[PDB]
Design a protein around this nucleic acid. Structure first.
Lengths: 133, 57, 78, 57, 134, 77, 132, 132
DNA sequence: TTAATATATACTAATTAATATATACT
DNA sequence: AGTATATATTAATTAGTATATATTAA
């Protein structure tokens, strides 16, 4: 199984580095693939560029990525994004621009999206989720 | 309906059912979700724009 | 019967690995064994990842949170 | 801009897939779309094998 | 070089099919690579799914993509996105959503980004632009 | 200690620490579990046998090989 | 991940074709790789050659292998075999000669070995899954 | 042509390193391929792991392997193994598990199996060469 | 009895690996 | 001393092109 981490899981891992997070990651890494979308990486890079301690935050992000596979947002994801965006709009469900791309990438890869806070993420059709806290 | 995947040389191939046979020697391959679209290949950008205009009008 | 060439990379010596002996890790353990050496895949543990991040001092990423604005309803095609 | 050649395999027509568009499955569904067709992977059927294993007995 | 088309160029090409667009494409295709970001394709696929005439719109999009290269949004684009988004907010400027991802992608590929208007990609640093008037 | 893996052309390469430098321009590569052994390559079978004779060790299989018949199983019907 | 089927799982699948095994294989195949060691295939081919219904049993094995990956017993496996055999003998525990090769192949590939008798459980560093 | 070395030839080469063995190897190596099955390597790795001087024995094995080709026991070998095992059992002919796999591998590769102890002597379709 | 199924091969194109250097930086 | 990346050329491998043919289920 491919486990795709949501931006919020990554931000909390870099900022707060909780022991429960590394234990969950080490357990899954033994028989599964831990990855992040290049969309999540775009968000993480924005977090670093926006900060005061850019060099240190980049260093922490680089260390965090040493153990992850960065999956490119590919042509295969686009049909799923199209279908998902339409369906969410039809049901009156509002999702942020990046979260919508991240969700559709998880769907295209048939991956489990690891989220810090579920909220409207469960309302997303054909999406496998796992919540950590 | 359905079509089988087989090997031709070191390449993978799809055996087309008779009803889906093409009258051209080469096709355009475009991704769509986990799969692909096979269609006639317009020779140029003028043919591309002409072909799109035929669908709409 | 497999062979690998020794070459220079900067001021360091290097061994060009044949394709069949490629590693999927970016670091390896080097241990002597007789006249030679053993190379074994050495990936950083998630514990080591978290320990290295904890050593680095910085301000938090997204202190106010993530601003992921929703897209606008577009009517591209008929 | 990917293209694929049409060739004959027995009395059937076939499409030689470029490496980038290779399927990891054995069968694909075939559905018309405009002047072409869409090919989607069918699940690697363990059902199909268990049916013929039971048929032989 | 690489010419990456923006969403507006692509939507206008499919809907209005102007002669000036195919003449620019045929001219450029002779010595350059015509491409779209997978981010543009995400927007175009949304256009298809949302529409009433889904089959026709998909067909037209498939024909449009036949002489294009679809470039995946890769890890190399991420650094440029982070820097561009931060700079635009610092200046109080907004070229939101996918257009920021699209622009980052052209910057990362060292490509000319093709536009329909001045609003789509405004005062965006390090970005090579080319406007095809409607 | 540790050595970094990098690209040289379209080939993968290992950067050797100074203490592990070779005085030859080509080495013998042998698999061992998930990894490999890099060692000098003897020029011939005589040099292979001479190098083994230099190494002092206890004999492998002193009591001999215990190759018992293949294990039995129920198979088809 | 990689799921490596043991000899007994394969023999029972071909002979008895249980729904439970089918269900398992249709479920795991969606996100994982179903494979066998060339050691298992050596044993299955012997099952066929030994058999009264040779032609039919070959046909059934051929169908069974169609949705399977046959993994060669490689040079990487040898170090694990040597270590595992020594350790098992040191603890006085006795495993079948082919089973010992099949187990050391699952360890070398970091695969889940699917068995018909877990209580195989004594083998160190081996991931197992039992099917009924 | 391919010359595949049996376990006994290997064990004697590593332990006793005789003059005659390297002369026969050097002679054949000029126009032929000297190789071992990964089944032989599994046995030699077990010999190393079992010993007291593990590091030295591994070093000797590594040196021995430097000029030979390690051939993986592949899917092609399986048909030959199944046929050979059935035939040997039918005739009441005893053969060790590993020797049966090593013999089938040579048969599959159409190789000459280099042996130490003659009685492999009764295996059909197997090309042998004995060294003293 | 006509598609389709299954496999096989000689060859050439295209792609990817490997060789052998170069360079500026930490 | 090591990190990191670059790249031209040739060597080698792998993909693709073209074809052939004997069986079998629709």
């Amino acid at each position: 199984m491919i486990y795709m981490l949501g931006t919020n899981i990554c931000v909390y891992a870099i900022n707060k580095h909780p022991d429960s997070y590394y234990n969950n990651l080490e357990l899954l890494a033994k028989n599964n693939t831990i990855a992040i979308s290049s969309i999540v990486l775009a968000e993480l890079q924005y977090g670093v560029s926006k900060s005061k301690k850019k060099e240190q935050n980049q260093s922490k992000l680089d260390i965090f990525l040493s153990r992850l596979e960065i999956i490119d947002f590919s042509a295969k994801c686009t049909f799923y994004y199209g279908e998902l965006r339409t369906e969410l709009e039809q049901k009156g469900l509002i999702i942020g621009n990046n979260d919508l791309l991240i969700a559709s990438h998880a769907i295209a890869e048939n991956a489990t999206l690891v989220t810090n806070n579920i909220k409207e993420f469960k309302r997303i059709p054909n999406l496998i989720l796992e919540n950590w806290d | 309906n359905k079509a089988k995947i087989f090997m031709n040389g070191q390449s993978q191939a799809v055996r087309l059912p008779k009803e889906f046979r093409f009258s051209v020697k080469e096709v355009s391959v475009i991704p769509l979700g986990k799969g692909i679209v096979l269609q006639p290949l317009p020779n140029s950008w003028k043919d591309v724009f002409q072909e799109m205009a035929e669908i709409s009008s | 019967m497999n062979k690998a060439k020794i070459f220079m990379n900067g001021q360091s010596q290097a061994v060009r690995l044949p394709k069949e002996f490629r590693f999927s890790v970016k670091e390896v353990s080097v241990i002597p064994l007789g006249k030679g050496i053993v190379l074994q895949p050495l990936p950083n543990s998630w514990k080591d990842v978290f320990q290295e991040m904890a050593e680095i001092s910085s301000d938090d990423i997204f202190p106010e949170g993530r601003k992921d604005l929703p897209p606008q309803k577009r009517k591209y095609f008929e």
